Design a protein around this nucleic acid. Structure first.
Ligand SMILES: [Mg+2]
Ligand SMILES: [Mg+2]
Ligand SMILES: [Mg+2]
Ligand SMILES: [Mg+2]
Ligand SMILES: [Mg+2]
Ligand SMILES: [Mg+2]
Ligand SMILES: [Mg+2]
Ligand SMILES: [Mg+2]
Ligand SMILES: [Mg+2]
Ligand SMILES: [Mg+2]
Ligand SMILES: [Mg+2]
Ligand SMILES: [Mg+2]
Ligand SMILES: [Mg+2]
Ligand SMILES: [Mg+2]
Ligand SMILES: [Mg+2]
Ligand SMILES: [Mg+2]
Ligand SMILES: [Mg+2]
Ligand SMILES: [Mg+2]
Ligand SMILES: [Mg+2]
Ligand SMILES: [Mg+2]
Ligand SMILES: [Mg+2]
Ligand SMILES: [Mg+2]
Lengths: 156, 80, 129, 82, 205, 122
RNA sequence: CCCGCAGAAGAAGCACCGGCUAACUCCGUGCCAGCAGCCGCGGUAAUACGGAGGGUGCAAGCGUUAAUCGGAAUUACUGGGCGUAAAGCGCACGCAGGCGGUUUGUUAAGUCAGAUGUGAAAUCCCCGGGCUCAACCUGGGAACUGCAUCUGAUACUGGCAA
RNA sequence: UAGCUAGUAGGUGGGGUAACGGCUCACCUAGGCGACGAUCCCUAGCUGGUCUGAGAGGAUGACCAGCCACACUGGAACUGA
């Protein structure tokens, strides 16, 4: 049931006395399309091994998002290093309007309609961390009413 | 019920004429800050009463000179 | 020099919540008391009180639900350098209604929901989420 | 001077006039004082075809406005059909 | 202003039966449906996200025989209308007259339906409508004028349409060769292999 | 950054400058070729690029690149030039339009014929 | 606009295929010829040059050039920064200017609420109608975020008094 | 581009205009504008609107419509509502 997605794979290098050693890193995101999403970063000598390790790591360390009918509860802002992300709930049918990393994470987390935009650096790793952080720091009417000691009707 | 303005005398060095200053508090179009703005008028004052510093009510009337088109109505806080 | 006591009050609330303090204290004024009443009725602080005859001190007892602070974010909107006024139509929706903006209308200080229901505008003191 | 006449709007070969009261000196489609109705010569069935505000027209005529021949015929037709 | 090329080549490139042939035979018996056209067809194209969006949009366009300018105008109208943009776009496309006559069965394919419409075989509400993109409204009646009612292609296509699945938003009498557009179709009535959200995102890029 | 500071001195836009000044906001310009010659590109390239010094109808004298394989351009030939710079060729910011007034289409072309002014073969 | 005759008969091109960017092979050339928006390509296996086949995108158009906005949060009001990346005056005093602890009263200037007048028509938007459809034309509405006047509220800011 | 202005700012009287007025003349007073940008230089017809933009904004003022100015260059009056 877990949809998985590879966002980026890069070839990093490490200069040694005998020459250069090229290894491959893979950033992947996995999610159950119904409010649970995690990201993993995997490092290996080859691309298949790197994606395998990243998929396993992302299949672990998932977190839970409070989704409202495939859309966000309210506008959220997220930030990690030099990437700042803004996500807004949108009416049904607009689809997912977001850049590549945000597109992947939201599509795998199960948000079907959202307006998004990334400011600052669009480096995929930090963009994924920031959007996941923003999705996690989002509160729903149930929890907000419980936290403030009110009913959901009282909060409207 | 007659449209009038209320300002402060800035000079009374002319015969039958004062230059008052109407101050208006207006929001800046772009930045939203409320900025103080001044408009300088020349006012005809028969009897040459009004002194510098007074608060005067002025009413717009027919032209009386090249630049004078406002006339004095009363003096408020005549104390300088 | 202290030129925004309301902003100072919000800053004390924010810092006390970040430092897990049970209660915070500040010099009192009637605007501060009105704001604290609004916060108490909206359920963002647990309690407030005033102690003192000549120099009243406002004490707010802060609220935590699951260890975490109740007030997630609180930001002064109208400030001495830039006053913000909104007509009844343009009153903001903070966190799409999950939070509250404190608006000072002509009938007293209230939330944006109360001002929109009463058909009034006014000054925007702060947002609370 | 002040007259009530038709300004020719619409497209090529499909006219649609706008009964407006205007100063005679102005252009046909130019400055006008008030719009008092419309007239569609290529009108089909179940369409108004001709709508004139008789009250405002009477007001302007009483103020001295003249009526172009076509507008007079339209007024006659309206008051004869209804 | 109309695609006159090989249709099964389109169906192979999209990798799906687009119903561009009458259905007397199997598309696998008429072509190598599993292989993309051209010399390098056996290749496995790892099409990117832009690739999948483009392929979806092209699939819908090649299903309905609509060029890009008109399709984009359709999208603008659908997004302007209230509701859901993808369902509105599919509703407009289904409301195309060619599509309607193909659905009711006076044509083996939409190309044949369009040929009838163009050659003035079709009447909506009693008047001959030549324009293929004409938008039929609910409660409209679409009938074939007699001088083409005698034509055999209509009969053969009607038999094929009886063979096919029947629409739920159209009611047809084959003997009278007339039909009624009862209501606008829905996403419950439209083929779920289409993914309109890809098209919405594509045109919102 | 302060509102008061911006009130006293608004944000001042960086004034964009055009990369093809001799065109004077025109899509093309006619000129009279003053010298046809070859030049050497900047390295990491090595070739003999064909350029011409041209006097434009507005008084500008500019260097224009002659693309394609084969040119009949000599002194006093009237050509049409368009924008577009040859990156590895300092001082050259324009292209000659082949198939225009006197720049004939390159012979024996079958692709980009519209780009090189070549009529359709029979 | 309608009817009749004849006969598929009179009607498909342009750009691109190294990445960004949808779509790849062969042959010719060999740091030359040349390509090029950027990164970049070409020194004898070139998917980047030229031709061919195949394919992709638009289509009576298709490309190139010029120009504006966008992307550019890259003049940042919404919406930015200033230890080391560009960026705190050597340091202080201080006029104009910007901001103002706390309570009560009064005013109603800012602020808010309502009403009237005006904000030309066309244009944009919504619901309809007419040209076979559309473009187009057109009825009604909404809008024109504004301005001025009158009547109220006084919380906050301002004025005045203590 | 930091100072500009002698009919220059105001006043009494006469004349002038369809009309108020330094509009003009005589006299008197010594003012008036300006750092909330006067004066000077460069560019420019203004608007409803058009394009772009999620919006705020940015660019723009072809066609249609309202207003202004000009009619080879400079000046002036006559006729006339
Ligand atoms: Mg780690
Ligand atoms: Mg950056
Ligand atoms: Mg005057
Ligand atoms: Mg066309
Ligand atoms: Mg590709
Ligand atoms: Mg070779
Ligand atoms: Mg350009
Ligand atoms: Mg910008
Ligand atoms: Mg920066
Ligand atoms: Mg430095
Ligand atoms: Mg220092
Ligand atoms: Mg105060
Ligand atoms: Mg007031
Ligand atoms: Mg219609
Ligand atoms: Mg209309
Ligand atoms: Mg209007
Ligand atoms: Mg007060
Ligand atoms: Mg006199
Ligand atoms: Mg000029
Ligand atoms: Mg923007
Ligand atoms: Mg302008
Ligand atoms: Mg005369």
């Amino acid at each position: 049931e877990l949809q998985e997605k590879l966002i980026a794979v890069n070839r990093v290098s490490k200069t040694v006395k005998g020459g250069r050693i090229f290894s491959f890193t893979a950033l992947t995101v996995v999610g159950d399309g119904n409010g649970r999403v995690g990201f993993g970063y995997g490092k290996a000598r080859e691309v298949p091994a790197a994606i395998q390790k990243a998929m396993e790591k992302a299949r672990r360390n998932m977190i839970n998002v409070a989704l409202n009918n495939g859309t966000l509860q309210h506008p959220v802002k997220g930030v990690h290093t030099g990437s700042r992300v803004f996500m807004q709930p949108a009416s049904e049918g607009t689809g997912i309007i977001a850049g590549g990393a945000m597109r992947a994470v939201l599509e795998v987390a199960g948000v079907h309609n959202v307006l998004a935009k990334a400011y600052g650096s669009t480096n995929p790793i930090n963009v994924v961390r920031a959007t996941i952080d923003g999705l996690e720091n989002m509160n729903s009417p149930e929890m907000v009413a419980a936290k403030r000691g009110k009913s959901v009707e009282e909060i409207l | 019920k007659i449209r009038t303005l209320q300002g402060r005398v800035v000079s009374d060095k002319m015969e039958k004429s004062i230059v008052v200053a109407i101050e208006r508090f207006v929001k800046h179009p772009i930045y939203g800050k409320f900025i103080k703005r001044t408009t300088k008028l020349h006012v005809h004052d028969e009897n040459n009463e009004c002194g510098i510093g007074d608060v005067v009510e002025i009413r717009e009337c027919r032209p009386l000179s090249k630049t004078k088109s406002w006339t004095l109505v009363r003096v408020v806080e005549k104390a300088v | 020099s202290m030129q925004d006591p309301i902003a100072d009050m919000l800053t004390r609330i924010r810092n006390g919540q970040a430092a897990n303090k049970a209660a915070v204290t500040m010099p009192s004024s009637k605007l501060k008391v009105a704001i604290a009443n609004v916060l108490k009725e909206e359920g963002f602080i647990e309690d407030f009180k005033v102690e003192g005859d000549t120099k009243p001190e406002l004490e707010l007892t802060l609220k935590y639900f699951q260890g975490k602070a109740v007030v997630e974010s609180i930001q002064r909107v109208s400030r001495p350098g830039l006053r913000i006024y909104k007509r009844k139509d343009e009153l903001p929706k903070v966190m799409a209604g999950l939070g509250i903006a404190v608006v000072s209308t002509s009938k007293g200080v209230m939330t944006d929901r109360a001002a929109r229901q009463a058909g009034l505008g006014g000054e925007i003191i702060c947002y609370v989420a | 001077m002040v007259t009530i006449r038709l300004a020719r709007h619409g497209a090529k070969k499909r006219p649609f006039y706008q009964v407006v009261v205007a100063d005679s000196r102005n252009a046909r489609n130019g400055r006008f004082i008030e719009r008092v109705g419309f007239f569609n010569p290529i009108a089909s069935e179940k369409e108004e075809g001709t709508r004139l505000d008789l009250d405002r027209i009477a007001h302007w005529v009483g103020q001295g406005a003249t009526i172009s021949d076509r507008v007079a015929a339209l007024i006659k037709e309206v008051n004869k059909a209804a | 202003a109309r695609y006159l090329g090989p249709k099964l080549k389109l169906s192979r490139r999209e990798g799906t039966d687009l119903f561009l042939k009458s259905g007397v035979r199997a598309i696998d018996t008429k072509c190598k449906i599993e292989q993309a056209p051209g010399q390098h067809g056996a290749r496995k194209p790892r099409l990117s996200d832009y690739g999948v969006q483009l392929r979806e949009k092209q699939k819908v366009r090649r299903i309905y025989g609509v060029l890009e300018r008109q399709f984009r105008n359709y999208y603008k109208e659908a997004a302007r209308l209230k509701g859901n943009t993808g369902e509105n776009l599919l509703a407009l496309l289904e409301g195309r007259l060619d599509n309607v006559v193909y659905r009711m069965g006076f044509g083996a394919t939409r190309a044949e339906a369009r040929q009838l419409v163009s050659h003035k075989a079709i009447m909506v509400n009693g008047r001959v409508v030549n324009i293929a993109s004409y938008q039929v409204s609910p409660n409209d009646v679409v009938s074939i004028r007699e001088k083409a009612k005698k034509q055999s292609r209509v009969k053969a296509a009607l038999e094929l349409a009886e063979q096919r699945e029947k629409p739920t938003w159209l009611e047809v009498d084959a003997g009278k060769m007339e039909g009624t557009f009862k209501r606008k179709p829905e996403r419950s009535d439209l083929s779920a292999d289409i993914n309109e959200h890809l098209i919405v995102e594509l045109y919102s890029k | 950054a302060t509102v008061n500071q911006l009130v006293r001195k608004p944000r001042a836009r960086k004034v964009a400058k055009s990369n093809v000044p001799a065109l004077e906001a025109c899509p093309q310009k006619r000129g009279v070729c003053t010298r046809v010659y070859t030049t050497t590109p900047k390295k990491p390239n090595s070739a003999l690029r064909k350029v011409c010094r041209v006097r434009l109808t507005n008084g500008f004298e500019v260097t224009s690149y002659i693309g394609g394989e084969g040119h009949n351009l000599q002194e006093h030939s009237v050509i049409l030039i368009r924008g577009g710079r040859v990156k590895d060729l300092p001082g050259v910011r324009y292209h000659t339009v082949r198939g225009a007034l006197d720049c004939s289409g390159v012979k024996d072309r079958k692709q980009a014929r519209s780009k090189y002014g070549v009529k359709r073969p029979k």
